[PDB]
Design a protein around this ligand. Structure first.
Ligand SMILES: [Zn+2]
Length: 252
DNA sequence: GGTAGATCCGGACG
DNA sequence: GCGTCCGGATCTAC
């Protein structure tokens, strides 16, 4: 799930788990658990805690419990579901949080690629994976000035910069390509080559693109198809180690 | 210390 | 058809 979908999960999951008390934690693929390093300690520490809140930072979900925060990343295919402990588990279920009311929060992921970290709540923001995370794209903390400051001091491409989690939180490959198209900026442009005008326009389109999605694609996955603006075939390359989609006429 | 490379995974695919 | 690819983000090494 991309940031907008992660926000939907945050909003929808919260009422389904708030006020429930963890009775057991069952782990079927311990490598998902990144902190504490021992998955047995991860399970043990969560028992007896009640779910109090659910927040989002970039694409991370932060489950707030009594003493601890659980920080979860679903990557591309991870999913959460609340269901009865009496029913058979779905395939690829790697972690289950069992509540005292006979319901469960289940984590599933065909790719087995997601991560979970648990720390005392007051520690979570200063440890991985939240430590160093950049500002929310929809917050005033993410501004043209902030983007310009990062752009001038790097030799990297503009796409590489937007994909950097320390620059802006959880802006995915899809939104990077869509925002660059909407801004009329080539993904391989050096970040430092962008004018003040271009930085402003890029910030504007990043906010509009992600904001529209939180509340329909021009280029992403559309290689070989006509640009919706000018009819030129969309092209695909590799930029910053990612599949990269752009209109060679409209982007400069 | 900025930045590239390695790493984790398995469905899709040559 | 069995090796290659690929996404995010963090860790490791230049
Ligand atoms: Zn075009």
């Amino acid at each position: 799930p991309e940031l907008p979908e992660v926000e939907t999960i945050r909003r929808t999951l919260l009422p389904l788990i708030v006020g429930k008390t963890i009775e057991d934690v069952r782990i079927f693929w311990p490598n998902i658990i990144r902190h504490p390093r021992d998955s047995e300690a991860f399970a043990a520490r969560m028992i007896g805690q009640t779910v109090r809140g659910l927040e989002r930072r970039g694409k991370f979900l932060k489950f707030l419990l009594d003493r601890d925060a659980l920080i979860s990343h679903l990557r591309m295919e991870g999913r959460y579901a609340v269901a009865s402990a009496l029913e058979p588990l779905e395939p690829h279920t790697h972690v289950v949080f069992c509540f005292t009311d006979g319901s469960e929060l289940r984590y599933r992921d065909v790719r087995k690629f997601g991560t979970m970290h648990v720390y005392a709540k007051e520690e979570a923001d200063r440890r991985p994976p939240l430590a160093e995370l950049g500002p929310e794209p929809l917050s005033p903390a993410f501004s043209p000035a902030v983007l310009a400051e990062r752009a001038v001091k790097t030799k990297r491409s503009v796409k590489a910069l937007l994909l950097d989690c320390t620059v802006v939180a959880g802006f995915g490959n899809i939104y990077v390509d869509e925002s660059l198209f909407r801004a009329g900026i080539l993904p391989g442009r050096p970040a430092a080559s962008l004018s003040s005008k271009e930085i402003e326009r890029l910030h504007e389109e990043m906010v509009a693109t992600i904001g529209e999605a939180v509340m329909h694609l021009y280029v992403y996955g559309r290689q070989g198809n006509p640009c919706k603006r000018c009819g030129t075939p969309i092209e695909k390359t590799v930029v910053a180690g990612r599949g990269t989609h752009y209109c060679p006429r409209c982007q400069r």
